């Protein structure tokens, strides 16, 4: 319905705003764009589903997220990709893992404080009805 489309539009506005705040945080610069295969040629064979904050914006605009739960699956994917690709004790790996966990924790904290739980419940019930 039209009222439901208004709900999903508000969801998209909210998600663009959260995503922008993550993307401008200097800690998360490494997550802002797709990984370049020239810099790390082994990435596409290890990481089966690359994800990054620019791709998240593209998916918002393609209406791929109908709930914040589905949005957070892609944030979690950015983080789990980083943990999987950087598992070693080396400081370069440990820095990226720390940033990845900070990205996840920051996204979840913004949503816990700013997402109304009845709004999310409404999105989930619309999604379930289709
Ligand atoms: C400028 C682009 C492209 N850079 C890379 O994809 C990249 C991936 C892994 C490493 C490095 C660069 N750096 C190294 O020193 C080699 C070992 S780790 N970035 C992509 C992610 O977000 C935006 C910026
Ligand atoms: C080895 C680098 C630290 N690592 C990165 O800068 C980096 C950049 C982009 C990505 C990644 C790492 N890897 C990921 O998995 C996230 C998505 S791409 N150092 C930087 C300072 O000087 C020395 C070397």
For 108-112, which contacts have Cβ atoms below 8 Å and span 24 or more sequence positions?
Answer: 108/72, 110/18, 110/21, 111/18, 111/68, 111/72
CATH fold label, 1-130:
Histone Acetyltransferase; Chain A (1.20.920)
Q: Which ligand is nearest to the CA of 92?
A: 2
Report the distance separating Cα 107 and Cα 118, nearest Å. 19
Q: Render the chain in DSSP notation, one character per residue.
A: -HHHHHHHHHHHHHHHHHHHHHHTSGGGGGGSSPPPTTT-TTHHHH-SS---HHHHHHHHHTT--SSHHHHHHHHHHHHHHHHHH--SSSHHHHHHHHHHHHHHHHHHHHHHHHS-HHHHHHHHHHHHH-
- Residues 6 or more apart in contact with residue 83 via CB below 8 angstroms: 97, 100, 101
Q: Indicate which technique resolved this structure.
A: X-ray
Q: Does any ligand 1 atom lie closer than 6 A to the CB of residue 36?
A: yes
Ligand 1 pocket test: pick from 29, 31, 35, 52 the residue with the most ligand atoms within 8 Å of its Cβ.
35
- Residues 6 or more apart in contact with residue 92 via CB below 8 angstroms: 86
Please list every residue in the chain followed by a chain break, i.e. its C lies more than 2.5 Å from the next written N. Answer: none
Give 117: exposed, middle or buried? Use CB within 10 Å, 0-12, 13-18, 19+.
Answer: exposed
User: From its phi and psi, is residue 117 left (phi > 0), alpha (psi between -120 and 50) or beta?
Assistant: alpha
- Phi (first) and psi of residue 88, to 5 degrees: -90, 170
User: Do residues 34 and 50 touch, judged by C-beta distance below 8 A?
Assistant: yes
User: What does the domain layout of the chain look like in residue ranges?
Assistant: 1-130
CA 70 to chain centre: 9
C-alpha of residue 65 to centroid of ligand 2, in Å: 29
How many C-beta atoms surround the C-beta of residue 62 within 10 A? 8
Tell me the CA distances in angstroms from 123 to 28, 56, 74, 94, one per residue in order: 28, 18, 17, 37
User: Do residues 55 and 29 touch, judged by C-beta distance below 8 A?
Assistant: no
Task: Pull the structure tokens for residue 71.
Answer: 């949005």
């Amino acid at each position: 319905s039209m009222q439901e489309e208004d709900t999903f539009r508000e969801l998209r506005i909210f998600l663009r705003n959260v995503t922008h705040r993550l993307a401008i945080d200097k800690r998360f610069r490494v997550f802002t764009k797709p990984v370049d295969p020239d810099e790390v040629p082994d990435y596409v064979t290890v990481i089966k589903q690359p994800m990054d904050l620019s791709s998240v914006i593209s998916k918002i605009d393609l209406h791929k997220y109908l709930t914040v739960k589905d949005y957070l699956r892609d944030i979690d994917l950015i983080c789990s990709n980083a943990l999987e690709y950087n598992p070693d004790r080396d400081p370069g790996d440990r820095l990226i893992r720390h940033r990845a966990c900070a990205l996840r924790d920051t996204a979840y904290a913004i949503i816990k404080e700013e997402l109304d739980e009845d709004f999310e419940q409404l999105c989930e019930e619309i999604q379930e009805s289709r």
